Amino acid sequence: SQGECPEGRAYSQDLGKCMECSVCKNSEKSDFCQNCPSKTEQPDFPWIWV
């Protein structure tokens, strides 16, 4: 499968190619910004050290 695009990026099925997620800022004209995942919950570190 060609859908193994990492985070901070997306893949546009329309254009038929993977791009970046940083592109999804202001100008909205891509149906790939839905690929850009945000998994890996940051708020998950017990104790209040460091």
Backbone atoms as SQL, in Angstrom:
CREATE TABLE atoms (id INTEGER PRIMARY KEY, chain TEXT, resi INTEGER, resn TEXT, atom TEXT, x REAL, y REAL, z REAL);
INSERT INTO atoms VALUES
  (1, 'A', 1, 'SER', 'N', 0.840, -1.226, 0.000),
  (2, 'A', 1, 'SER', 'CA', 0.000, 0.000, 0.000),
  (3, 'A', 1, 'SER', 'C', 0.862, 1.258, 0.000),
  (4, 'A', 2, 'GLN', 'N', 0.389, 2.293, -0.689),
  (5, 'A', 2, 'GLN', 'CA', 1.116, 3.554, -0.767),
  (6, 'A', 2, 'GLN', 'C', 0.575, 4.559, 0.245),
  (7, 'A', 3, 'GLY', 'N', 0.048, 4.050, 1.355),
  (8, 'A', 3, 'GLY', 'CA', -0.496, 4.916, 2.383),
  (9, 'A', 3, 'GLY', 'C', 0.278, 4.828, 3.683),
  (10, 'A', 4, 'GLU', 'N', 1.602, 4.773, 3.577),
  (11, 'A', 4, 'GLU', 'CA', 2.460, 4.686, 4.753),
  (12, 'A', 4, 'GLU', 'C', 3.178, 6.008, 4.992),
  (13, 'A', 5, 'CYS', 'N', 2.484, 7.101, 4.706),
  (14, 'A', 5, 'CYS', 'CA', 3.043, 8.435, 4.889),
  (15, 'A', 5, 'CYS', 'C', 3.122, 8.788, 6.376),
  (16, 'A', 6, 'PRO', 'N', 4.320, 9.155, 6.870),
  (17, 'A', 6, 'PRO', 'CA', 4.521, 9.505, 8.283),
  (18, 'A', 6, 'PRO', 'C', 3.750, 10.755, 8.699),
  (19, 'A', 7, 'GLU', 'N', 3.895, 11.134, 9.967),
  (20, 'A', 7, 'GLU', 'CA', 3.219, 12.306, 10.504),
  (21, 'A', 7, 'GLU', 'C', 3.745, 13.580, 9.856),
  (22, 'A', 8, 'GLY', 'N', 3.232, 14.721, 10.309),
  (23, 'A', 8, 'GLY', 'CA', 3.658, 15.999, 9.763),
  (24, 'A', 8, 'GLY', 'C', 3.639, 16.008, 8.248),
  (25, 'A', 9, 'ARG', 'N', 2.696, 15.268, 7.677),
  (26, 'A', 9, 'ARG', 'CA', 2.571, 15.169, 6.231),
  (27, 'A', 9, 'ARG', 'C', 1.236, 14.539, 5.838),
  (28, 'A', 10, 'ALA', 'N', 0.943, 14.523, 4.537),
  (29, 'A', 10, 'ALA', 'CA', -0.290, 13.929, 4.055),
  (30, 'A', 10, 'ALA', 'C', -0.143, 13.392, 2.633),
  (31, 'A', 11, 'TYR', 'N', -1.125, 12.597, 2.208),
  (32, 'A', 11, 'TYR', 'CA', -1.134, 12.017, 0.868),
  (33, 'A', 11, 'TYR', 'C', -2.448, 12.348, 0.165),
  (34, 'A', 12, 'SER', 'N', -2.356, 12.962, -1.012),
  (35, 'A', 12, 'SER', 'CA', -3.547, 13.341, -1.764),
  (36, 'A', 12, 'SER', 'C', -3.888, 12.297, -2.821),
  (37, 'A', 13, 'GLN', 'N', -4.991, 11.588, -2.606),
  (38, 'A', 13, 'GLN', 'CA', -5.432, 10.561, -3.541),
  (39, 'A', 13, 'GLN', 'C', -5.781, 11.178, -4.889),
  (40, 'A', 14, 'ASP', 'N', -6.244, 12.419, -4.854),
  (41, 'A', 14, 'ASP', 'CA', -6.611, 13.133, -6.070),
  (42, 'A', 14, 'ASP', 'C', -5.384, 13.353, -6.947),
  (43, 'A', 15, 'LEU', 'N', -4.356, 13.966, -6.370),
  (44, 'A', 15, 'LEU', 'CA', -3.121, 14.233, -7.091),
  (45, 'A', 15, 'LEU', 'C', -2.334, 12.947, -7.315),
  (46, 'A', 16, 'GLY', 'N', -2.562, 11.967, -6.451),
  (47, 'A', 16, 'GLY', 'CA', -1.871, 10.698, -6.565),
  (48, 'A', 16, 'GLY', 'C', -0.417, 10.789, -6.146),
  (49, 'A', 17, 'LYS', 'N', -0.173, 11.386, -4.982),
  (50, 'A', 17, 'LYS', 'CA', 1.186, 11.534, -4.474),
  (51, 'A', 17, 'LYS', 'C', 1.173, 12.089, -3.056),
  (52, 'A', 18, 'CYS', 'N', 2.206, 11.767, -2.284),
  (53, 'A', 18, 'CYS', 'CA', 2.295, 12.240, -0.909),
  (54, 'A', 18, 'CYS', 'C', 3.048, 13.559, -0.827),
  (55, 'A', 19, 'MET', 'N', 2.610, 14.406, 0.092),
  (56, 'A', 19, 'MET', 'CA', 3.226, 15.707, 0.306),
  (57, 'A', 19, 'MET', 'C', 3.442, 15.931, 1.798),
  (58, 'A', 20, 'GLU', 'N', 3.593, 17.183, 2.198),
  (59, 'A', 20, 'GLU', 'CA', 3.811, 17.506, 3.602),
  (60, 'A', 20, 'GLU', 'C', 2.553, 18.060, 4.249),
  (61, 'A', 21, 'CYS', 'N', 2.554, 18.066, 5.570),
  (62, 'A', 21, 'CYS', 'CA', 1.430, 18.585, 6.340),
  (63, 'A', 21, 'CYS', 'C', 1.641, 20.059, 6.641),
  (64, 'A', 22, 'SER', 'N', 2.905, 20.465, 6.718),
  (65, 'A', 22, 'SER', 'CA', 3.235, 21.857, 6.972),
  (66, 'A', 22, 'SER', 'C', 2.565, 22.746, 5.931),
  (67, 'A', 23, 'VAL', 'N', 2.232, 22.156, 4.781),
  (68, 'A', 23, 'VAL', 'CA', 1.576, 22.900, 3.711),
  (69, 'A', 23, 'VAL', 'C', 0.177, 23.335, 4.133),
  (70, 'A', 24, 'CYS', 'N', -0.468, 22.506, 4.939),
  (71, 'A', 24, 'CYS', 'CA', -1.810, 22.796, 5.423),
  (72, 'A', 24, 'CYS', 'C', -1.778, 23.896, 6.480),
  (73, 'A', 25, 'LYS', 'N', -1.603, 25.136, 6.035),
  (74, 'A', 25, 'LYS', 'CA', -1.549, 26.272, 6.948),
  (75, 'A', 25, 'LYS', 'C', -2.739, 27.205, 6.736),
  (76, 'A', 26, 'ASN', 'N', -2.659, 28.040, 5.705),
  (77, 'A', 26, 'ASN', 'CA', -3.728, 28.983, 5.401),
  (78, 'A', 26, 'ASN', 'C', -4.475, 28.576, 4.135),
  (79, 'A', 27, 'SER', 'N', -3.811, 28.712, 2.990),
  (80, 'A', 27, 'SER', 'CA', -4.412, 28.359, 1.708),
  (81, 'A', 27, 'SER', 'C', -4.926, 26.923, 1.722),
  (82, 'A', 28, 'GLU', 'N', -6.243, 26.774, 1.822),
  (83, 'A', 28, 'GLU', 'CA', -6.861, 25.455, 1.845),
  (84, 'A', 28, 'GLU', 'C', -7.333, 25.047, 0.453),
  (85, 'A', 29, 'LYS', 'N', -6.658, 24.061, -0.125),
  (86, 'A', 29, 'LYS', 'CA', -7.004, 23.569, -1.453),
  (87, 'A', 29, 'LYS', 'C', -6.440, 22.172, -1.671),
  (88, 'A', 30, 'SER', 'N', -6.489, 21.355, -0.625),
  (89, 'A', 30, 'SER', 'CA', -5.981, 19.991, -0.693),
  (90, 'A', 30, 'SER', 'C', -6.820, 19.053, 0.166),
  (91, 'A', 31, 'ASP', 'N', -7.220, 17.926, -0.414),
  (92, 'A', 31, 'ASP', 'CA', -8.019, 16.939, 0.304),
  (93, 'A', 31, 'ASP', 'C', -7.121, 15.926, 1.013),
  (94, 'A', 32, 'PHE', 'N', -5.828, 16.236, 1.095),
  (95, 'A', 32, 'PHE', 'CA', -4.866, 15.350, 1.737),
  (96, 'A', 32, 'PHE', 'C', -4.595, 15.750, 3.174),
  (97, 'A', 33, 'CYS', 'N', -4.956, 16.969, 3.542),
  (98, 'A', 33, 'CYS', 'CA', -4.748, 17.418, 4.909),
  (99, 'A', 33, 'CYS', 'C', -5.493, 16.525, 5.894),
  (100, 'A', 34, 'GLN', 'N', -6.180, 15.509, 5.378),
  (101, 'A', 34, 'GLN', 'CA', -6.899, 14.583, 6.228),
  (102, 'A', 34, 'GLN', 'C', -6.009, 13.399, 6.564),
  (103, 'A', 35, 'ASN', 'N', -4.905, 13.278, 5.836),
  (104, 'A', 35, 'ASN', 'CA', -3.964, 12.194, 6.080),
  (105, 'A', 35, 'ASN', 'C', -3.112, 12.527, 7.293),
  (106, 'A', 36, 'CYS', 'N', -2.673, 13.776, 7.341),
  (107, 'A', 36, 'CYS', 'CA', -1.859, 14.287, 8.441),
  (108, 'A', 36, 'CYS', 'C', -2.418, 13.841, 9.793),
  (109, 'A', 37, 'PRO', 'N', -1.816, 12.806, 10.408),
  (110, 'A', 37, 'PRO', 'CA', -2.263, 12.287, 11.696),
  (111, 'A', 37, 'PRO', 'C', -1.634, 13.025, 12.874),
  (112, 'A', 38, 'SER', 'N', -2.285, 12.944, 14.031),
  (113, 'A', 38, 'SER', 'CA', -1.791, 13.601, 15.235),
  (114, 'A', 38, 'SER', 'C', -1.730, 12.621, 16.402),
  (115, 'A', 39, 'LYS', 'N', -1.490, 11.351, 16.089),
  (116, 'A', 39, 'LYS', 'CA', -1.407, 10.313, 17.110),
  (117, 'A', 39, 'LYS', 'C', -0.297, 10.622, 18.111),
  (118, 'A', 40, 'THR', 'N', -0.079, 9.704, 19.049),
  (119, 'A', 40, 'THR', 'CA', 0.953, 9.876, 20.068),
  (120, 'A', 40, 'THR', 'C', 0.598, 11.016, 21.017),
  (121, 'A', 41, 'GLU', 'N', -0.239, 10.715, 22.006),
  (122, 'A', 41, 'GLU', 'CA', -0.657, 11.713, 22.982),
  (123, 'A', 41, 'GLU', 'C', 0.541, 12.251, 23.757),
  (124, 'A', 42, 'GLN', 'N', 0.709, 13.569, 23.736),
  (125, 'A', 42, 'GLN', 'CA', 1.816, 14.209, 24.440),
  (126, 'A', 42, 'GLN', 'C', 1.604, 14.164, 25.952),
  (127, 'A', 43, 'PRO', 'N', 0.398, 14.530, 26.420),
  (128, 'A', 43, 'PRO', 'CA', 0.066, 14.533, 27.848),
  (129, 'A', 43, 'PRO', 'C', -0.044, 13.120, 28.415),
  (130, 'A', 44, 'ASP', 'N', 1.104, 12.505, 28.685),
  (131, 'A', 44, 'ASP', 'CA', 1.136, 11.153, 29.230),
  (132, 'A', 44, 'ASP', 'C', 2.493, 10.852, 29.858),
  (133, 'A', 45, 'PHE', 'N', 2.835, 11.598, 30.903),
  (134, 'A', 45, 'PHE', 'CA', 4.105, 11.412, 31.595),
  (135, 'A', 45, 'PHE', 'C', 3.944, 11.636, 33.097),
  (136, 'A', 46, 'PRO', 'N', 3.700, 10.557, 33.863),
  (137, 'A', 46, 'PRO', 'CA', 3.527, 10.644, 35.317),
  (138, 'A', 46, 'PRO', 'C', 4.639, 11.444, 35.989),
  (139, 'A', 47, 'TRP', 'N', 4.480, 11.695, 37.285),
  (140, 'A', 47, 'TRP', 'CA', 5.470, 12.451, 38.044),
  (141, 'A', 47, 'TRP', 'C', 5.615, 13.865, 37.489),
  (142, 'A', 48, 'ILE', 'N', 6.024, 14.794, 38.348),
  (143, 'A', 48, 'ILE', 'CA', 6.201, 16.183, 37.942),
  (144, 'A', 48, 'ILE', 'C', 7.677, 16.569, 37.934),
  (145, 'A', 49, 'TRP', 'N', 8.512, 15.682, 37.398),
  (146, 'A', 49, 'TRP', 'CA', 9.947, 15.929, 37.327),
  (147, 'A', 49, 'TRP', 'C', 10.359, 16.336, 35.916),
  (148, 'A', 50, 'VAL', 'N', 11.468, 17.068, 35.815),
  (149, 'A', 50, 'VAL', 'CA', 11.981, 17.530, 34.526),
  (150, 'A', 50, 'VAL', 'C', 10.858, 18.066, 33.636);
